[PDB]
Design a protein around this nucleic acid. Structure first.
Ligand SMILES: [Cl-]
Length: 345
RNA sequence: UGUACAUA
């Protein structure tokens, strides 16, 4: 009603305050114009008691606001000015339905904002609800962002249950690594968890490495292992890539994994890949020249020339050059061997 | 000539 009146001429109630809303918070918070009023007031006010004047009403109506298209923004703003006592009341208002809020488009942003802002005891209280639904939650279109947020903002020892969920069955890190949302959880885990946690997670990735490497989402998991795994992980991967260079290079997704090995590898890593690329089986064209005729592997050769040492390049040039005008015959060869003219002049 | 990552 005051809402319906304020909507008429908004800049005509320019002296409206937060405590003039104190019975209409629900209607205001669920209204496009009303929620923008509340937010603009919370951001401009330097008055703790005006802000707290509707806070009791935000708490009382929280469960109806957290998954509202406009109310979720209102609830979130009340994490921006508290300390623990103010954060604890908010968390209590929602804690019991956190298992559902994590799956919801709007309410999941309240859960993320809470983890962003509240102290660690309160974070752990939110995670204790997530424990119940964590497997579903990891690969939910909404739930994965809450799990990602947990891994980024909570110390590693209190997300152990998330890591143990990735390891809950033999096929779980595979299942997660090929899921469009699950794969982001795996990547956050490789970025932020302790080596005690990432070791068995990476161990499982190695077991089904080829499959994950050529999956449209798993290839990012493998790339994150190359960057965030141990020196011994990079060695097991470069070694396997080198031994199967042509097969990795000629497939859509796994070709990016070689490029990552080239980009992040040390000199001896690059040496093993160039070595495999230049081996000439007594009855065949060298692997590198075949790679240059392939829709994906030609980009891998280009990445090679760009990242390897001059002496490793010399080995490539001396193996390619007895076969070039034979390569211009091929489709896009003109543009392929032109991008490499820099190294043939 | 070849790949992702969410709210008015
Ligand atoms: Cl949804």
């Amino acid at each position: 009603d005051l809402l319906t009146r304020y909507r008429a001429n908004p800049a005509m109630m320019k002296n409206l305050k937060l405590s003039d809303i104190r019975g209409a918070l629900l209607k205001f918070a669920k209204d496009q114009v009303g929620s923008r009023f509340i937010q603009q007031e919370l951001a401009s006010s330097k008055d703790r008691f005006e802000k707290d004047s509707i806070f009791d009403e935000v708490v009382s109506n929280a469960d109806e606001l957290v998954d509202d298209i406009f109310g979720n923004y209102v609830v979130q703003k009340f994490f921006e000015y508290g300390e623990e006592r103010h954060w604890a009341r908010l968390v209590d208002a929602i804690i019991d339905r956190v298992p559902e809020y994590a799956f919801q488009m709007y309410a999941c942003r309240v859960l993320q904002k809470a983890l962003e802002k509240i102290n660690e005891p309160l974070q752990i209280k939110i995670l204790s609800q997530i424990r119940h639904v964590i497997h579903r939650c990891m690969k939910d279109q909404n739930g994965n962002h809450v799990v990602q947020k947990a891994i980024e903002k909570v110390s590693p020892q209190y997300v152990q249950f998330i890591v143990d969920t990735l390891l809950e069955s033999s096929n779980t890190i595979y299942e997660m690594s090929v899921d469009p949302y699950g794969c982001r959880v795996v990547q956050r885990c490789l970025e932020h968890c302790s080596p005690s946690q990432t070791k068995p997670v990476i161990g499982q990735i190695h077991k089904r490495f080829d499959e994950i490497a050529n999956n449209q989402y798993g290839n990012y998991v493998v790339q994150h292992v190359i960057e965030h795994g141990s020196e011994e992980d990079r060695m097991v991967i470069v070694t396997r890539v080198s031994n199967n260079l042509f097969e990795f290079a000629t497939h859509k997704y796994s070709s990016n994994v070689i490029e990552k090995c080239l980009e992040q590898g040390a000199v001896y890593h690059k040496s093993m890949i160039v070595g495999a690329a230049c081996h000439h089986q007594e009855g065949s064209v060298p692997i590198v020249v075949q790679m240059m005729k392939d829709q994906y592997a030609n980009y891998v050769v280009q990445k090679m020339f760009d990242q390897v040492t001059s002496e490793q390049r010399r080995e490539l040039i001396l193996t390619v050059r007895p076969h070039i005008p034979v390569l211009r015959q091929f489709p896009h060869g003109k543009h392929i061997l032109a991008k490499l003219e820099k190294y043939f002049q």
